[PDB]
């Protein structure tokens, strides 16, 4: 061969997988995710295809879901830091049934003029927020009394999800898998480089994925391993299913004095009949959606297998479907969607809630005045396998489930991978440097 | 008849084409790579350190200002016995870097310990006499 000599090159387009922090970006305008500090979005972002190069994607290793997990919780706690403690409101409640029982009409006597202007301030309380005192009437008190000090969320904080974007830092790039058939992992062929991702709204829910993206012209079902009962099945829907939710009760609210310079909002009277929360779901769209899902499930789980039975498994907040329409947390019985194996949902409202899990300090929602209405659609859902059974293709009871809230972002992040680019490299050449 | 793109390589695409063809856009790729508050502040400092690290080596090696510079270190064919054309017209940057990944520190050391050392010693001697 030729006498070869070392030549140094810079700008070499090669890279290695790496994990780092992506910068937030937002369509700039006390909403939790509406941080005062965030990069304005690019009105004309670029995307280029590699084509000579493929890349190994694995949605179960995208560490970006961890960044979102921690940052989102931090933002929640920060916005709701200067909020009102319920500590002096642990006073026992003399409760009777509210005439029309999920709502009790109770009284108490605290603080009784501890350098302030206060009184008994009777009010309405929800069953799901209190603990019975079986040694009394039965009487009630705040369920938090024997656990922790919790605060009433600041009335000035909105909880509307914001579609936050995330962009690569210098020296790093975001690769995207554009294969319509891409599942949990593999050598994605259609790979492109993206300057910055689209916005993902931090929607928090249990059992069904709401207001997300749609599948590429068919239902696509993903899992780490369809044979492993310890894994979950992620279903991305071809078209979404329409759901319309309402809180028909027109509620008032009252500010009460709890100390000098301190106020607390209580549920006031209710105007009109007291009715149940519920959501209306189109059976047509729901059933047709299931048809496509079943067809795909057959590919792995058998051609005559009975699927989709009633809700079961986990504590009440896992067994019920959960969402936060209007700022109030609704827990509805999804069984009405899965009450027939191979639509109006009854629903209750809770105010003392836990953002995915909370230790010690927790959030109590304020009462919302008026009526709550919203509209959304089911764009995905999580199925769980019921466990061991006869191998024969008889049953596989894909119950709704999933309590790991991180999957509400992983379900979108699966498209992306972050790498570190190494511009420095060498190769042989023909001649020696003309060294004197 | 030929269909054409606009101007030049978008970003990294050449990584899977031969190193010969890929060399055309080193100016593009280099420029693009070279160039809440606290987390970003940390990232900025890290970017600077990575930036300067590369500049340090390019300075020492006598390569500063160039994206292509010839050294005076001979190629030891033990690393790879491929000819010039067998590499440059037949192998990509991603593939090449892997082939000689385990010689990176070796060759980098040789550039500094042998050539740079020589160039600085002899330079002074030539300036003196």
């Amino acid at each position: 061969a030729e006498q070869l000599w070392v030549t140094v090159y810079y700008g070499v387009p090669v890279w290695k997988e790496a994990t780092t922090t992506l910068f937030c970006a937002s369509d700039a305008r006390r909403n939790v995710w509406a941080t005062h500090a965030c990069v304005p979005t690019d009105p004309n972002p670029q995307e280029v295809v590699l084509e000579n190069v493929t890349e190994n994607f694995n949605m179960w290793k995208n560490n970006m879901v961890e960044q979102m997990h921690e940052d989102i919780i931090s933002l929640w706690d920060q916005s709701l830091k200067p909020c009102v403690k319920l500590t002096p409101l642990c006073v026992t409640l003399n409760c009777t049934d509210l005439r029309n029982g999920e709502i009790k009409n109770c009284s108490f006597n605290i603080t009784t003029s501890m350098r302030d202007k206060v009184q008994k301030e009777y009010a309405l309380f929800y069953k799901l927020d209190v603990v019975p005192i079986k040694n009394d009437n039965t009487s009630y008190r705040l369920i938090s009394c024997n656990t922790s000090v919790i605060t009433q969320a600041c009335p000035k904080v909105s909880f509307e999800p914001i579609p936050i974007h995330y962009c690569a830092p210098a020296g790093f790039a975001i690769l995207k898998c554009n294969d319509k058939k891409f599942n949990g992992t593999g050598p994605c062929t259609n790979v492109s480089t993206v300057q910055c991702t689209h916005g993902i709204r931090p929607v928090v829910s249990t059992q069904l994925l709401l207001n997300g993206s749609l599948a590429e012209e068919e239902v696509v079902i993903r899992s780490a391993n369809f044979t492993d009962n310890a894994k979950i099945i992620i279903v991305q829907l071809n078209k979404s299913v329409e759901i319309n939710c309402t809180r028909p009760n027109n509620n008032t609210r009252k500010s009460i004095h709890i100390g000098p310079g301190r106020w607390f909002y209580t549920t006031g009277e209710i105007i009109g009949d007291i009715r149940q929360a519920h959501c209306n779901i189109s059976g047509t769209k729901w059933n047709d959606t299931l048809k496509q899902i079943v067809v795909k499930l057959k590919e792995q789980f058998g051609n005559k297998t009975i699927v989709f039975n009633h809700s079961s498994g986990g504590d009440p907040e896992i067994v019920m479907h959960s969402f936060n329409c209007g700022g109030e947390f609704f827990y509805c019985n999804s069984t009405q969607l899965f009450n027939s194996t191979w639509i109006v949902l009854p629903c209750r409202i809770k105010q003392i809630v836990n953002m995915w899990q909370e230790v010690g300090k927790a959030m109590y929602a304020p009462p919302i005045k008026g009526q709550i209405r919203c509209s959304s659609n089911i764009t995905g859902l999580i199925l769980i396998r019921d466990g061991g059974k006869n191998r024969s293709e008889n049953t596989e009871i894909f119950r709704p489930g999933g309590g790991d809230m991180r999957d509400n972002w992983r379900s979108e992040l699966y498209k992306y991978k972050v790498v570190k680019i190494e511009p420095l490299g060498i190769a042989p050449t023909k001649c020696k440097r003309r060294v004197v | 008849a030929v269909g054409i793109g606009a101007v030049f390589l978008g970003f990294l695409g050449a990584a899977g084409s031969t190193m010969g063809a890929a060399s055309m856009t080193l100016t593009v790729q280099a420029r693009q790579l070279l160039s809440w508050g606290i987390k970003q502040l940390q990232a900025r400092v890290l970017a600077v350190e990575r930036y300067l690290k590369d500049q340090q080596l390019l300075g020492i090696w006598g390569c500063s200002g160039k994206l292509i510079c010839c050294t005076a270190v001979p190629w030891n064919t033990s690393w790879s016995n491929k000819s010039y054309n067998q590499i440059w017209n037949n192998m990509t940057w991603m593939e090449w870097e892997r082939e000689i990944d385990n010689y990176t520190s070796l060759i980098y050391t040789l550039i500094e310990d042998s050539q740079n050392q020589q160039e600085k010693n002899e330079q002074e001697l030539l300036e003196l006499d």
Partner: antibody
Amino acid sequence: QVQLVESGGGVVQPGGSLRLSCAASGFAFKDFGMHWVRQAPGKGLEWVAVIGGGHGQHQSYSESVKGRFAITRDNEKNKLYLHMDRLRTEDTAVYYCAKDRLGRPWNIGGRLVYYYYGMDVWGQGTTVTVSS
Amino acid sequence: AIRMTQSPSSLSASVGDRVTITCQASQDIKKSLNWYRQKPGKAPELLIHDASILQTGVPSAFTASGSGTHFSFVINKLQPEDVGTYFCQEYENLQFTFGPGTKVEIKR
């Protein structure tokens, strides 16, 4: 061997639409650039459009079809598509899918370009009628 | 792409005769010319590419020549099997225009 399976045709009304799908195997569909041509009854062969290989980062349309037809491709299905929208009766023809002699995205001059030297592989097409 | 013209539109001979098709460009196309042959019920068959080179598998029964604006397709001997319409296509620019086509048939 090499075989193109060209279907999706039939009869539509003017103002309607369809999409043709030419499935192919026996060659690296994903790599070579492809053509669309059509022949109306009693006429010669009219060139319709071209799409490059790889992901198809370059196209050209005949002035007779530009703005009314779109070309795309799926490299995993190995199918070439023609989106036949807002059609007129003048669009009645047998449409063919074809492969260029090369069509590859060469890296030259710092940019990708597609070199075409004309169709050399094809099936027999399918009839699309637009009438009322 | 430059408009191609072919002549005569109707070309015939007895079996075994030497039959040629005239094809011209209104502007210099240098060499970018393919010759196709269509038979009833069959998509046009590529016989010659780059104005002179037979396609792989095509027998040496045909030739072609010319450059610039003046080209010709030559049928060394016209056999019944060679009856069809021959097309002069230009591919210099991304319009890949086809010429009118010349029908070649056996005299009767």
